[PDB]
């Protein structure tokens, strides 16, 4: 890689906030927070709310209710 | 309107195969390299093939479908 022409790159850890699952990868962005890491090495830490494990599709279960049908709505409203 | 034409350039071969020629004799006038310069033959600025040394002229085939001129001193 040519020198002084590429955006700064630094290794960084990632923790899924919702579940805590951890994965180490490089990125351009830097996080003031830093955490240790196996092999006894510290890296800036980027907390992410949603990851592959967190995302419902990967797990195989979906949170969404999928809404209600109008027949059922009518019965609920009118007690029928 | 037609009626124009340039002077003919008297191209073609100027020396026969098996003919003895002196150094620098023009062997073949051409546009582009219809024939290639072989041994002891140079190609001029405008594709003219000339003998670099004295000898006998020889036209051979350069491979499958290309020709070549060589000058062999005796």
């Amino acid at each position: 890689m040519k020198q002084d022409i590429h955006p700064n790159y630094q290794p960084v850890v990632f923790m899924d906030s919702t579940t805590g699952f951890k994965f180490l990868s490089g990125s351009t962005k830097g996080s003031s927070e830093t955490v240790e890491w196996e092999d006894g090495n510290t890296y800036p830490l980027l907390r992410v709310e949603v990851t592959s494990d967190s995302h419902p599709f990967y797990t195989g279960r979906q949170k969404f209710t999928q809404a209600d049908g109008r027949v059922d709505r009518f019965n609920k409203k009118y007690g029928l | 309107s037609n009626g124009r034409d340039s002077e003919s350039k008297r191209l073609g071969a100027k020396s026969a195969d098996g003919q003895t020629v002196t150094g620098g004799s023009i062997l073949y006038r051409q546009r582009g390299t219809k024939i290639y310069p072989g041994v002891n033959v140079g190609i001029g600025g405008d594709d003219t093939l000339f003998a670099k040394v004295d000898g006998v002229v020889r036209f051979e085939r350069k491979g499958r479908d290309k020709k070549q001129v060589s000058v062999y001193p005796v």
Binding site: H6, Y9, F23, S25, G26, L46, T51, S52, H55, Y58 | -
Partner: protein
């Protein structure tokens, strides 16, 4: 390095088993990743391409090569050599790192993300994903974008068949529909 680790450990033996490879050399691998951002707006204003290039560099970690129109096209007001479109090539560690980031972070942040296409294959074992909008990558900062844009990521592998390609991408993690 996580994705390379995952590949070599789990993915490689699993593909070997499924596809009955005589030697591990036959194992398909992600050969390279080419991220291409076609910017026709540069003709109207070159700074659109400039900012697009900057965003792409932030996303990729490598300065992009600014590809140029090989042919002048009056239809798009395009003159030959006009610097429209950029690309970046990632191999080895950078390739694996970017791919893992795409799987984990950039993909979820897509609006109403229903997964990735499962037919966008050339027919030779090489895939492409069309990202409609940026701001899904953490490095875009959701504000620096003056004009939102998209891109095309081309994953070129050593697989001969879309089937082996599909399994490999799934193993590395690909939200196929």
């Amino acid at each position: 390095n996580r994705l390379k680790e995952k590949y070599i450990k789990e993915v490689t033996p699993s593909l070997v088993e499924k596809f009955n490879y005589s030697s591990v050399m036959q194992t398909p691998k992600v050969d390279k990743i080419v991220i291409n951002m076609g910017v026709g707006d540069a003709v109207s204003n070159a700074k659109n391409l400039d900012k697009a290039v900057e965003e792409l560099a932030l996303i990729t970690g490598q300065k992009p090569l600014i590809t140029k129109a090989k042919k002048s096209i009056a239809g798009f007001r395009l003159r030959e050599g006009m610097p429209i479109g950029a690309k970046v090539t990632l191999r080895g560690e950078r390739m694996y790192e970017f791919l893992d980031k795409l799987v984990t972070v950039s993909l979820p942040r897509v609006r109403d993300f229903h997964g990735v296409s499962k037919k966008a294959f050339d027919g030779r074992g090489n895939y492409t994903l069309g990202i409609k909008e940026q701001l899904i990558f953490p490095e875009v900062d959701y504000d620096l974008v003056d004009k939102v844009r998209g891109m095309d990521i081309v994953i070129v592998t050593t697989a001969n068949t879309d089937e082996e390609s599909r399994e490999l991408l799934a193993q590395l993690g690909m939200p196929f529909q």
